[PDB]
Design a protein around this nucleic acid. Structure first.
Lengths: 204, 118, 259, 153
RNA sequence: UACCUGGUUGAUCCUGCCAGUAGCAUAUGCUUGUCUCAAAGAUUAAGCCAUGCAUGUCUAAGUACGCACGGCCGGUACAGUGAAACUGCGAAUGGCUCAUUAAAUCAGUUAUGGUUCCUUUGGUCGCUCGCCACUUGGAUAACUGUGGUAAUUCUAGAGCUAAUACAUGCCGACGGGCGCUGACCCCCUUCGCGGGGGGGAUGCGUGCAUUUAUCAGUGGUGACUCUAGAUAACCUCGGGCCGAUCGCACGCCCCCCGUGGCGGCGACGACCCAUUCGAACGUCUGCCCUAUCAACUUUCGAUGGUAGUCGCCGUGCCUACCAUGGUGACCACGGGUGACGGGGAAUCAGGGUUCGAUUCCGGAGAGGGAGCCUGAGAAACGGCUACCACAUCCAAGGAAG
RNA sequence: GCGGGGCCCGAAGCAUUUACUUUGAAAAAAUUAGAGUGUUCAAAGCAGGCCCGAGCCGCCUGGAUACCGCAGCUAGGAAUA
């Protein structure tokens, strides 16, 4: 019976306003979903209109976006690394909207290798026999070697970003609203924005 | 007060019953109601108990395990009449329909057949 | 209160229905439909007050449940159906074929039409938009929507559609000089040519309407309904031709025809 | 003197910051595209709402707030309370019993967007209205015009 | 009809009230032959209530395997008429009362570019490339037959049987087009060469709706982060649509071939779009008496700022972290009201005074507070659960208000 | 608005800002003010009126209008403050 209306606030002057009707149905109860990382639990709550909203009790994967090279893949959620609204929601590992997440790199490593044919995540080599020696060589024809050697302008990544492709996990940001639509979508941190939060994680 | 499956406590408790549990047919839709139901563990404080055979053994109790009641309403949907008579395919469902005989005294002795569905 | 209302009291009904006060407590309550209900007129009081083919609320029902009352070329069987403006009713057995037009005193006027002019109606559009896959839509005065219209039809333009086909026959563009009819406010029912449309950024646009006898007036843009190209109307007019007479001018023409 | 003084990354929701940085796009000469829009009814967009560097959800020029409704005017009477000022609009109320007026007022909190510099105590500010922005702040500042200034010793 | 008259004194002129006089509205007194309209348990007690009633509902068209009947028209699916029960849809209207409520309601005004909407209409409903479809699966009521209780619209067990109930699921359209890819083009500058193209072998994806990101800038508005287009991808198992439905007149092609193909009018449901009926929240201006009520509001949201959480959406509506604000002698705040607000009513020179519980619009509430279920719409009370208060039946185990 | 001319005037600035005034919208009926009409009269009601020679598919006509404060929205006026 937790409500959301305005007649229980003290008014602008600082006077008590007395209740002039009962609490109504269209200030419906507001419990928190508290979506956390695990298997997939989705529960459905009807609303006014007979419509549905999918509140997310427990989530595994996401559909995060890359943007700078325009890639979107499903990817599972490793960890929550920073939250702006509350420093206590990260010690309980709860998915909210503007929290900075940590996801893997194996959808983004293999797409970037299957599109540019550069090794990625490598620092040492001498282990690259089974599916890495073949994908960059592939026995191309003439004009297929043509269209990939001209991508030596747009294969670069800024040094702050491939520093976290080497050691495995990329941190991204949720842009969806879990517990409202039931999904954890969003975009990957990059650029001057990534210098921001990687200060705000390091300063913790 | 009737018993209810799944109490696992002998005695009498009070349950909030919705549509579709047991022991409570509602009066209008969406109504929930608190009613006293008896536990599933049996005691000596029962006036009657229901009791159903799952295996017949030695001999015939007279009037209990003999005198077969004819199941007078046969299959009506055109998939439980095809399963009953083991019809393979397109075996003219309209032909093998079961028909009820009618034996009033003051009227002519009738027969009735159902509709078909699906 | 706890939901939508489905009663209507007799004195709260629109007075251009010209209802009684002492024949009952309640009013007909026109159903949800194409026209808004203060503007509109239901089918019940049309055949027992305006045409007197029936006497009760039962008798209007058992003409209508014999399935010959044709609103806009469709048989509508409920007797509280909201009729509205510029629609053709059609008895189709004794063949009167009325069109519902405001007279010059603000009321829906009984007005016959020839059975070949009954084939169409006119509608002011209220919104044009592109729909899915990049195709055009428009929505009209009534609830009829049209796909693929002639793309010259701007907002608040007047189209002519035929019933039994349903695609737009003629459009007639809202321009100064044309012959409009006002369907809302204190001046409604008068028919005159458009003088100018004076804009307001964000507020309500008002137009000035010159009639055919010098009495210019003004109502805002949401009440204006163009039915003529320059000076000739495409539909048949009622008597008075949308010329409001003054009360001395109503006095003498009425008390000399009763000579 | 930086902009990022919050605990979340403040930015505009529409413009995309990353534009193929590489040997083509060098980090030495670096601007970002500034989303602004223009409000109808003939109100100008000041230079600081275009060549500024700020960020505001509730600025009418660069946020997600859309003015439509009344337009009023008042006097800036207290200039505390970050990004929202309180203005007082005096008026006259008429008592027809005594055939005389009654000098009334009521003040109102309005959103001072940071595209205005010389907003000091006692100015004229015309104000339009929009969606609810806070518990009491329903309006948004459109156009300051100075008073009691232009030369001070 | 812009009106007065009697009373302080032995008289006088005054100030001043008293009394007179005329309405209209409650009651009461005596009285009352006829007839037209006609208020009527509002005030004190929004006190308590016996009994009986005021919400229910079949079309040609969801389900008859009751003989309740039918001509049982005849050797079998159903001539129809149909009770009962399942399903659907109303029961959220109306009615009643005026207790609460003094910028709250309400009134004019203006918004939703910050949202939802059964229905009604009008649209959209082969756009999706993927061994039942000539039809798939499981139950259940009414019924039959046993019951249990002092007692209720209490229900149990087992036997049957249906669907427009509850689920599953396909053919056809479907031939492909596009985009991403991609073992030969050699005809170009093979001169050692660099080549310039169209092309196939190849495997993915492909509609609407939902979710996120990026690109461009058909139609719109005063004004978009609008509508439409483009690319990468998502699609929640308490899982989005993409018809396993029922009537009526029956007709057409019949070349495979006398069995298979085509059809008229409906009635139902179906995501989404607009419409209609709305609802909700906002803006402006307006309310009575009181200072023997002058400071208030902020630990416990008071005013704002960022980020969110849920909410149908905007917003301290909440939460966290920061800022110290907001209102006030132009009467805040507190108190009172025999305060429901208004259209209105009585009054009548002009200005006003006073009433407005009461049929119209709006709001609030069903003994008092509170919490929910179903549903498009209720924090519903001739719905439910609990406490408080009042009260009924009991065979004293419980039942119902 | 009949890249450079003519019977030509729109967009634009409102170049102090307001009060005031005038205009135009938009304002639910009922009630009141009143139009019409022998409810037999009247209070009321919104009806009714006219020849039948029977064609009389029955004819004509009403169900007005004024008043909705202040506050907003428009246009015009600029003394007064």
């Amino acid at each position: 019976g937790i409500s959301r209306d305005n007649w229980h606030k003290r008014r602008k002057t600082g006077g008590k306003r007395k209740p002039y009707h009962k609490k109504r149905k269209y200030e419906l109860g507001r419990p928190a979903a508290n979506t956390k990382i695990g298997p997939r639990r989705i529960h459905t709550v009807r609303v006014r209109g007979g419509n549905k909203k999918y509140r997310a009790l427990r989530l595994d994967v996401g559909n995060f976006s890359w943007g700078s090279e325009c890639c979107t893949r499903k990817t599972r959620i490793i960890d929550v690394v920073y939250n702006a609204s509350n420093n206590e929601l990260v010690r309980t590992k709860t998915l909210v909207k503007n929290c900075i997440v940590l996801i893997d790199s194996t959808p983004y490593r293999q797409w970037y290798e299957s599109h540019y044919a550069l090794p990625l995540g490598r620092k040492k080599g001498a282990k690259l026999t089974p599916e890495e020696e073949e994908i960059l060589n592939k026995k191309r024809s003439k004009k297929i070697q043509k269209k990939y050697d001209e991508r030596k302008k747009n294969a670069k990544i800024s040094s702050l970003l491939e520093e976290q492709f080497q050691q495995g996990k990329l941190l991204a940001c949720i842009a969806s609203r879990p517990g409202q639509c039931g999904r954890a979508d969003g975009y990957v941190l990059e650029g001057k924005e990534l210098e921001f939060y990687l200060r705000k994680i390091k300063a913790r | 007060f009737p018993m209810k499956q799944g109490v696992l406590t002998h005695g009498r408790v009070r349950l909030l019953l919705s549509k579709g549990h047991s022991c409570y047919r509602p009066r209008r839709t969406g109504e929930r109601k608190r009613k006293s139901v008896r536990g599933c563990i049996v005691d000596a404080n029962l006036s009657v108990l229901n009791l159903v055979i799952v295996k017949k053994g030695e001999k015939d109790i007279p009037g209990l395990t003999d005198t077969t009641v004819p199941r007078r309403l046969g299959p009506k949907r055109a998939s439980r009449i095809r399963k009953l008579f083991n019809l393979s395919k397109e075996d003219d469902v309209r032909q093998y329909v079961v028909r009820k005989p009618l034996n009033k005294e003051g009227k002519k002795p009738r027969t009735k057949a159902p509709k078909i569905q699906r | 209160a706890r939901g939508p209302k489905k009663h209507l009291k007799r004195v709260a009904a629109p007075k251009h229905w010209m209802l009684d006060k002492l024949t009952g407590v309640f009013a007909p309550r026109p159903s949800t439909g194409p026209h808004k209900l203060r503007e509109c007129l239901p089918l019940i009081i049309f055949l027992r007050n305006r045409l007197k083919y029936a006497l009760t609320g039962d008798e209007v029902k058992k003409i209508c449940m014999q399935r010959f009352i044709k609103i806009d070329g469709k048989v509508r069987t409920d007797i509280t159906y909201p009729a509205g403006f510029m629609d053709v009713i059609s008895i189709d057995k004794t063949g009167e074929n009325f069109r519902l037009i405001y007279d010059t005193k603000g009321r829906f006027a009984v007005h016959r039409i020839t059975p070949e002019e009954a084939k169409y109606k006119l509608c002011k559009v209220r919104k044009i938009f592109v729909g899915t896959k990049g195709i055009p839509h428009l929505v009209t005065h009534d609830a009829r929507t049209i796909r693929y219209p002639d793309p010259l039809i701007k907002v608040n333009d007047t189209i002519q559609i035929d019933l039994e086909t349903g695609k737009i026959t003629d459009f007639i563009k809202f321009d100064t000089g044309n012959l409009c009819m006002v369907t809302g406010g204190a001046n409604l029912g008068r028919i005159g040519v458009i003088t100018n449309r004076e804009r307001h950024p964000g507020s309500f646009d008002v137009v000035h309407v010159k009639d055919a006898n010098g009495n210019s007036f003004a109502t805002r843009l949401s009440n204006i309904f163009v039915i003529g190209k320059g000076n000739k109307p495409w539909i048949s007019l009622p008597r008075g031709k949308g010329i409001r007479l003054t009360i001395a001018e109503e006095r003498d023409k009425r008390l000399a025809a009763k000579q | 003197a930086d902009i990022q003084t919050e605990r979340a990354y403040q930015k505009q929701p529409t413009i995309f910051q990353n534009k193929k940085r590489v040997l083509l796009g060098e980090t030495g000469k670096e601007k970002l595209p500034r989303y602004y829009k223009n409000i109808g009814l003939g109100f100008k967009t000041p230079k600081e709402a275009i060549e500024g560097t700020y960020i505001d959800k509730k600025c009418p020029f660069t946020g997600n707030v859309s003015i439509r409704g009344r337009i009023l005017s008042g006097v800036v009477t207290k200039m505390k309370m970050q990004r929202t000022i309180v203005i007082r609009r005096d008026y006259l109320h008429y008592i027809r019993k005594y055939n005389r007026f009654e000098k009334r007022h009521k003040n109102m909190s309005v959103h001072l967007s940071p595209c205005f510099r010389d907003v000091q105590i006692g100015d004229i500010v015309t104000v339009g209205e929009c969606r609810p922005l806070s518990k009491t702040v329903r309006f948004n500042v459109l156009k300051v015009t100075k008073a009691a200034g232009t030369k001070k010793q």
